[PDB]
Amino acid sequence: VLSEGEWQLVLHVWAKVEADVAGHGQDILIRLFKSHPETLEKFDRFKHLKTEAEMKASEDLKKVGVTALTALGAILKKKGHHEAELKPLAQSXATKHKIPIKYLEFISEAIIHVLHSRHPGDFGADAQGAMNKALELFRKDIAAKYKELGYQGA
Numbered sequence: 347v348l349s350e351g352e353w354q355l356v357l358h359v360w361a362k363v364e365a366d367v368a369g370h371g372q373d374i375l376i377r378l379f380k381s382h383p384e385t386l387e388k389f390d391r392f393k394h395l396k397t398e399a400e401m402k403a404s405e406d407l408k409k410v411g412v413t414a415l416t417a418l419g420a421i422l423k424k425k426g427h428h429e430a431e432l433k434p435l436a437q438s439x440a441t442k443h444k445i446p447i448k449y450l451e452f453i454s455e456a457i458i459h460v461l462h463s464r465h466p467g468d469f470g471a472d473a474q475g476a477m478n479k480a481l482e483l484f485r486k487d488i489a490a491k492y493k494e495l496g497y498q499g500a
């Protein structure tokens with residue numbers, strides 16, 4: 347759905363994410379919670395984590411962020427051919443954690459913010475646009491799968 351060059355921009359900056367997945371995952375979750383604190387209500391085990399320091403010191407939080415970014419990394423590496431990887435995640439999101447699509451918009455914003463804050467030399471305008479399209483496609487395809495399951499995502 348993207349150009350091949352756009353996918354290389356997405357996977358180039360993703361290679362920089364992979365140099366430190368746990369750190370990126372902490373930054374991305376903490377950014378999400380800062381910008382949209384209503385998202386923290388979905389994480390029953392992280393409600394007692396009151397400061398950014400406490401969140402960064404939580405191996406639980408750190409593990410969740412690695413799982414979530416590993417899943418996204420696997421999907422991004424498919425270059426759009428991700429229906430097999432996306433269905434189980436849609437099933438989990440839709441019928442277990444109950445994540446509205448807007449929350450995936452929020453965490454997509456967090457991802458764009460953290461990656462540009464850490465790798466501006468690897469994440470200019472063209473690369474942000476590529477990743478934005480990639481995350482858009484992830485979100486749209488997952489929302490289709492939500493409907494398929496009988497949840498509309500809001």
Ligand code: HEM
Pocket residue numbers: 385386388389390391410413414415417418435438439443445449450453
């Ligand atoms: C790029 C977007 C996201 C990806 C790829 C992702 C992926 C994952 C994966 C793979 C898991 C563990 C497996 C599973 O539960 O099926 C997980 C767990 C979870 N996700 Fe995410 N997720 C994303 C965004 C979000 C958002 C925005 C929220 C809520 C605001 C959320 C809430 C949760 C919760 C509560 C869990 C359970 C954590 C635990 O193990 O205790 N996720 N996510």
